[PDB]
């Protein structure tokens, strides 16, 4: 997995 903004990546 997740970005610095807690998104799935």
């Amino acid at each position, epitope marked *: 997995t*997740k*970005d*610095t*903004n*807690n*998104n*799935l*990546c």
Partner: antibody
Framework: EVNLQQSGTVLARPGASVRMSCKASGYSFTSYWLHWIKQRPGQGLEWIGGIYPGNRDTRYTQRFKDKAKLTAVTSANTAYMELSSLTNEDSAVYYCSIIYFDYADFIMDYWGQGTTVTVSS | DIVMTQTPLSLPVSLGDKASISCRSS???????????LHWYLQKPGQSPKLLIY???NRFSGVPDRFSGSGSGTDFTLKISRVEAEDLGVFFC?????????FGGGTKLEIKR
């Protein structure tokens, strides 16, 4: 559940370095990024950096790069921000924030109360 | 930083009336995972901002139905179908699909009576 308790008001003397905390609960402190934000009295919100408690990996914007040091105590679910070489501009209110929108039955957008700093001699 | 520009910056409304705030970004807000992370907060004076609508049109818990979110790519809109005294505050639009998470300048909704 989910609440960020931050440290109370701090008075600092120019050139000094404050240190504030934010205690999290209600979610897995080790699994997400925690953001630190500064709201100078003049409304506008600005992101400073974030930290992944789990592996202690950090992220900072170019500005706060030499003005902030993020740290976290996982056994204590507590993250710490430390502003160095204070000045007049460093006077604002700092929140710690947790966002997460990828699971429908578990949406998280919570903020601390804010740790108002006052830089004065 | 991806710039969030709101307008109008001050918003005079009578109670019962309707209002809209427009938010726009320097670059698209569609994340590689296909989601568009654009949200709207409402900061009361002295309190931390509070979420109203996440991912363009999703209303957070407890938020009245009076609030609606819409928008796409780079152009977004928040709407208050009916204005009440509670709505008093500054409304922000934010972006979390890119690093850094950024916010608009704000929009003070000023009541008329």
């Amino acid at each position: 559940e989910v609440n960020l308790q931050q440290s109370g008001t701090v008075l600092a003397r120019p050139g000094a370095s404050v240190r504030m905390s934010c205690k999290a609960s209600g979610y897995s402190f080790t699994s997400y990024w925690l953001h630190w934000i500064k709201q100078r009295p003049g409304q506008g919100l600005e992101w400073i950096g974030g930290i992944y408690p789990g592996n202690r990996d950090t992220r900072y914007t170019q500005r706060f790069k030499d003005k902030a040091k993020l740290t976290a105590v996982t056994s204590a679910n507590t993250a710490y921000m430390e502003l160095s070489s204070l000045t007049n501009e460093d006077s604002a209110v700092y929140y710690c924030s947790i966002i997460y929108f990828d699971y429908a039955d578990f949406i998280m957008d919570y903020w601390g109360q804010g740790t108002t700093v006052t830089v004065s001699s | 930083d991806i710039v969030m520009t709101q307008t109008p910056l001050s918003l005079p409304v009578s109670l019962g009336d309707k209002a809209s705030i427009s938010c726009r970004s320097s670059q698209a807000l569609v994340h590689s995972n296909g989601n568009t992370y654009l949200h709207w907060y409402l900061q009361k004076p002295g309190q931390s901002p509070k979420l109203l609508i996440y991912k363009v049109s999703n209303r957070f818990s407890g938020v009245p139905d009076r609030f609606s979110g819409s928008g796409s790519g780079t152009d977004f809109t928040l709407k208050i179908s009916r204005v009440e005294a509670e709505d008093l505050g500054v409304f922000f639009c934010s972006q979390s699909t890119h690093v850094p998470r950024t916010f608009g300048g704000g929009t003070k909704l000023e009541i008329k009576r």
